[PDB]
Amino acid sequence: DFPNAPPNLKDFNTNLFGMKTVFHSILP
Amino acid sequence: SLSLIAAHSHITGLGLDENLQPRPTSEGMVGQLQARRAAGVILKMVQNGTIAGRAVLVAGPPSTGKTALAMGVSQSLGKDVPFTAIAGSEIFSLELSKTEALTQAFRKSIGIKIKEETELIEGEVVEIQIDRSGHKQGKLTIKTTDMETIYELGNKMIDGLTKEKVLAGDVISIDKASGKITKLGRSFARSRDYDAMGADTRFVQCPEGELQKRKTVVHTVSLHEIDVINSRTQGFLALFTGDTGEIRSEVRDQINTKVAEWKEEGKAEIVPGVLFIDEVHMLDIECFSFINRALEDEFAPIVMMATNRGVSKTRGTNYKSPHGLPLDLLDRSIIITTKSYNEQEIKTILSIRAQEEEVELSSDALDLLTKTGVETSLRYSSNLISVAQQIAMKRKNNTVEVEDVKRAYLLFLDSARSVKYVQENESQYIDDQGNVQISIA
Ligand SMILES: Nc1ncnc2c1ncn2[C@@H]1O[C@H](COP(=O)(O)OP(=O)(O)O)[C@@H](O)[C@H]1O
Ligand SMILES: [Mg+2]
């Protein structure tokens, strides 16, 4: 980061390499 | 097939026995026993499928069964064996060179039977449940008439389902190889839900049997079709429009190699066919020189050629030829000859034609038609049959008789009487020099 600060470790590892229902349907 | 009673509508095939012995009359053909034997030998040669690139010439006087023999060969071959019948003048085009037209004709006469193996799952989706935060997960249920199973869906499968907008009651098909989802249609239970239906909607039943099925399907595609498809990016449209252009030679070589590879792997079979060129004497010397080398190929079909001219002038040359064809082509061609018919054969042919045209001839009318045929021509009497039928029907008489045939003879002339009349009154018809006496007094 610009103020010479390191980023988050998990974010670092993700960036180097790149609960509930949301849709339910049933026929009546 | 959409058809009307035509000139060769009565030929179901060559009337050959088991030993290739022609019958006196069978499958709509009369006489020409030697020619029919030769045609049957050529037909068996085609059916065997080992001999490649053989030229056959059919020669004989006009109206002697050449095109009839070709039609009989085509009918005996039946479907699944290609048979391209073209005229001599058809190859001349403003878009394709003559060699390209001949190449396309040759490739059309060879068919490739290709097998594609597809594994699919089809059924009516009963319930879909998708959970999404991270990647999404979901479960899906598909039923058949005698099966039901719940499947778990991956992230890409869920993405495909969402981009297809699948709902319950839809019948869908999934290819387990690629996961592509195709919506066959909707169930009948959803039909009542609307008054007007969109263009995309379709109502289909629930598929029967097992949910996952393996099936192989055979496709009949000619070599020319493969070349056109593999030439451009949308060649299958050119297969209908005809705007295919002169396909690259390298493309044809690639397609030959690909077909050979498929045949070795056993997923494609070669079914050689017959190329029939009507009136070959209208071809040029360049076309014949191409045909000479074209027959010397492993994929070359068996070429049938029908000509009637004797010692005539080959097109594109300044010399006469034995059949209107150069000696080099005649060297690599076996000749099937036809013979002029006698009275009984003409009578039987006229009877067959009358039966095909559902016209009830009388014995005396048949004799008169036979006499006119032997005196003038077979086609003249064959054409007079239907006109006589119409005249008889106008006379509110359901059967034709001698008076109707006589009236048809009087009204409609033949070649000889027309020549006599044009010669008797040469001054009222335009000549080569263009002089004509329109005035009468
Ligand atoms: N052996 C035969 N059996 C039945 N019909 C025939 C026979 N020979 C000729 N015909 C009929 O005579 C007509 C003349 O056709 P065709 O002989 O093919 O003309 P060309 O030989 O001059 O091209 C055709 O309609 C055909 O059905
Ligand atoms: Mg003909």
Q: Which amino acid is at B59?
A: A
Q: Which residues pair with B268 in a beta bridge?
A: B114
Residue identifier of the C-alpha nearest atom 23 of ligand 1: B67
Query: Which residue shows structure tokens 């039901």?
Result: B148
Single out the residue of B276, B124, B121, B320 nearest to residue B212, CA to CA: B121
Q: Which residues pair with B147 in a beta bridge?
A: B144
Tell me the C-alpha distance between B33 and B14, whole Å.
10
Phi, psi torsion values for B71, nearest 5 degrees: -65, -40
Q: Which of B129, B133, B168 sits opposite A27 (nearest CB)?
A: B168
Which runs of E-coded beta strand occur in B101-156? 110-131, 137-144, 147-153
**CATH code of the domain covering residue B133:** 2.40.50.360
For B168, B412, B420, B434, B441, the CA distances from B430, given in Å and listed in that order, are: 80, 22, 16, 5, 18
**Residue B57 Cα to ligand 2 middle (Å):** 13
Which residues on B lie below 8 Å from A10 (Cβ)? none
Residue A26 to residue B127, Cβ atoms within 8 A? yes
Task: List, as residue ranges, the binding site of B for ATP.
Answer: 60-67
What DSSP designation does B23 have?
Answer: P
Residue B126 to residue A26, Cβ atoms within 8 A? yes
Residue A27 to residue B169, Cβ atoms within 8 A? yes
CA angle B409, B357, B22 (to 5 degrees): 105
Experimental method reported for this structure = cryo-EM
CA angle B328, B333, B338 (to 5 degrees): 125
Report CA Rg, chain A: 20
What DSSP designation does A4 have?
Answer: T
Q: Starting at the edge strand that comes first in sequence, how are the strands of the sheet with B333-337 ordered? A: B83-87, B274-278, B302-307, B55-59, B333-337
Tell me the C-alpha distance between B14 and B12, whole Å.
7
CA angle A18, A23, A26 (to 5 degrees): 145
Residue B131 to residue A21, Cβ atoms within 8 A? yes
- Beta-carbon-side half-sphere exposure of residue B375 (alpha carbons within 13 Å): 11
Q: Which of A19, A24, A27 sits opposite B129 (nearest CB)?
A: A24
| Ligand with smallest separation from the Cα of B62 | 1
**CATH code of the domain covering residue B418:** 1.10.8.60
**Residue B45 Cα to ligand 1 middle (Å):** 23
Ligand 1 neighbours, Cβ below 6 Å, are B 7-8, 29-32, 62-68, 349, 378-379
> Which domain covers residue B186, as residue numbers?
115-217
Nearest ligand 1 atom to the CA of B68 is 18
